[PDB]
Amino acid sequence: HDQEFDPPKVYPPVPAEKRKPIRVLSLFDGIATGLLVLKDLGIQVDRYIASEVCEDSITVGMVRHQGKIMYVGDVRSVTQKHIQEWGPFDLVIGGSPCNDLSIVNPARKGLYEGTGRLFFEFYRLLHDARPKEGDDRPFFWLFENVVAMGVSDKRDISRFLESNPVMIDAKEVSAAHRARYFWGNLPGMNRPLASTVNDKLELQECLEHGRIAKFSKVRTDQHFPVFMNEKEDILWCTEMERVFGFPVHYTDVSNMSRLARQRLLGRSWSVPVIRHLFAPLKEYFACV
Amino acid sequence: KLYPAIPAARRRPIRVLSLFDGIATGYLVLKELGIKVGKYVASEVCEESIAVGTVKHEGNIKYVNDVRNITKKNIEEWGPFDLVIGGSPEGTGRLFFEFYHLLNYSRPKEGDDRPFFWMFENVVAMKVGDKRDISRFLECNPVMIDAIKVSAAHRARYFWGNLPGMNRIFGFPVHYTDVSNMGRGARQKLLGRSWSVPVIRHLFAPLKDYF
């Protein structure tokens, strides 16, 4: 599909003597997957600012990052003054809530409802955190969304962000079936999925003991995908974290139920997919 | 917000970025403002107002086939725009965010002291959430200009922009409203529904002083 045409801006590599840690703005953070991947790659983080509403996700971040995260409330409360007073950013990330962007809803409300239009909030903060002309600072940005969108919606998003959406499927690097569009200007945006041997490709490596995988991988019949003691059992939450690439026992931070952990892990990013995406940032920024 | 004034001896033509207008309001109303407009841009998805604009204005207009085709190269190729207007004909937020996306790329950068003027207008069918979110997006507050002090038929609009003379001094005009049109039903459909004559000349009034 060639509807628009624009070259991706490739920044020159900075040497090690002018190497600086990253300043990261994370708009729709949720479960703090971005800072988790950044800490796993061994990258020094000078400032991480997450604008999260949901208190369970804020609790996930406060437990798993120990007060490193600077919290904002709603993204509508962020102005241009808040962007220009919190220093210039080096990495902007986010994925808008796809309640009305997904075409799996028969009665979907579209891009221009209060769940979808938050994307434009992103664009506004994309417009504020972007450096002006004449500044050769390497500025990188990343937007995530689902594959189940309309043609006009994806076309308008691609025109607004001015980048080619690469499609990445979790089955090439992890044990999940979800294809996601990624807008951004990272180097090697469409390079193939370098599967890490430490990543759990099959489903059975993500299971616990005493459980047999019925399928080869899981999706995002009135049965259950795991047999347990010759009985079909629901897929566990820690096993869901191992499928989604998270560390073991990650989203157990408060007194939330099983349904809350499902709602948090469903909306979260895939750790291996991000690790692939954030990989070339290591040569552009600080290392630890 | 107040900007310093340029002397009026610098007579330069006006670059107009008119968005989702359809029938060309900006080119015609700036022709009958009394200043020379340089180039005009027109684009609309619907075909009726594009047909009216390509028959009426004799083809002195750069036309774009669709509003979903203008890129940053289309902004920087046709010169930096001094005037950016959005003329109103679930596509309400569609037209607004198209206007805001193209306004972000026509806004002068930090260092340019160019006098930049823009204008957005919208109907009174706006949700309170739409109101407060869009007022966060534009970082400004609109003004209500109504047709209860100036006209008989109901017309109420709220305006955002960089156009002064909008806080307390403006009341109701007397001459151009009563010499504008006669009120009949077909004329209520055509020129009474039309949003070209009533306030847009007053919003383009403080622009002719700079150029």
Ligand SMILES: Nc1ncnc2c1ncn2[C@@H]1O[C@H](CSCC[C@H](N)C(=O)O)[C@@H](O)[C@H]1O
């Ligand atoms: N207006 C808003 N501003 C900021 N966050 C919001 C928000 N509305 C909802 N959220 C929260 O932000 C998250 C966006 S949903 C997708 C999250 C993202 N894909 C991830 O990496 O986890 C949701 O968990 C939701 O609870």
